[PDB]
Amino acid sequence: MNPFEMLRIDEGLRLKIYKDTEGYYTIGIGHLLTKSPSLNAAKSELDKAIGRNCNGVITKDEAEKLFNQDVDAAVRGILRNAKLKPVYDSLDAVRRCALINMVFQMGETGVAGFTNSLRMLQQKRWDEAAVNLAKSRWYNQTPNRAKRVITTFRTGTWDAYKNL
């Protein structure tokens, strides 16, 4: 595994402009393009973003790159986050990876709301923490994806996604 494949599985990949749950134009792995109703504008923002005559559709790699700039942006925020910063620093590279997964999935705000759970991770209390996170509304909401993320944390390996 690697982080793109992680999200590939979790968020899914989209190579053609789409609308999300909130109506927003998006593309690749959750890459929101714009908030205005206009396809016209997304199209344009994309072309731009990607750098050529895409026309509402990109490549796989073209997407990875977008995906790369977004992980980058997420990390950056994490480090500017005071609740998130310390946790993130405590984490070995791969679990850092799970934390981006979550953030990606629920925003920085939502993530930092798992008080006890973060403390647990920070402390490097890998099992209890596993246990704990299985209690949340997160786990009921999106079970599969929650389970995978949790194993990542438990173990600090790509066990849950590698055969996938």
* DSSP assignment of 99-158: HHHHHHHHHHHHHTT-HHHHHHHHTT-HHHHHHHHTTSHHHHHSHHHHHHHHHHHHHSSS
Instruction: Find the CATH number of the domain harbouring 117.
Output: 1.10.530.40
Instruction: Please confirm, yes or no, whether 108 is among the known catalytic residues.
Output: no
Instruction: Please confirm, yes or no, whether 20 is among the known catalytic residues.
Output: yes
- Active-site entry in 20, 72, 89, 159: 20
Tell me which residue of 111, 49, 120 sits closest to 90, measured CA to CA.
120
**Alpha carbon separation from 128 to 45, 86, 97, 123, 124 (Å, rounded):** 44, 19, 19, 11, 10
Domain range for residue 13?
1-164
- Active-site entry in 10, 11, 62, 70: 11
Quote the number of domains for the chain.
Answer: 1
Q: What is the DSSP letter of 48?
A: I
Q: Which residues contact 159 (CB under 8 A, 6 or more apart)?
A: 151, 152
How many whole angstroms separate alpha carbon 28 and alpha carbon 146? 21
3 state DSSP class of 45: helix
Residue 132 annotated as lining a ligand binding site: yes
Which H or E run includes 66?
helix 60-80
Q: Left if phi > 0, otherwise alpha if psi is -120 to 50, otherwise beta: which for 121?
A: alpha
Where do breaks (C to N over 2.5 Å) occur in the chain, by preceding residue number?
A: none
How many whole angstroms separate alpha carbon 149 and alpha carbon 107? 15
Count how many Cα atoms sit within 13 Å of the Cα of residue 6 in the half-sphere of its side chain.
Answer: 28
The separation between the first and the last C-alpha atoms of the chain, rounded to the nearest angstrom, is 9
* Residue pair 113/103 in contact by the 8 Å Cβ criterion: no
Experimental technique used to determine this entry? X-ray
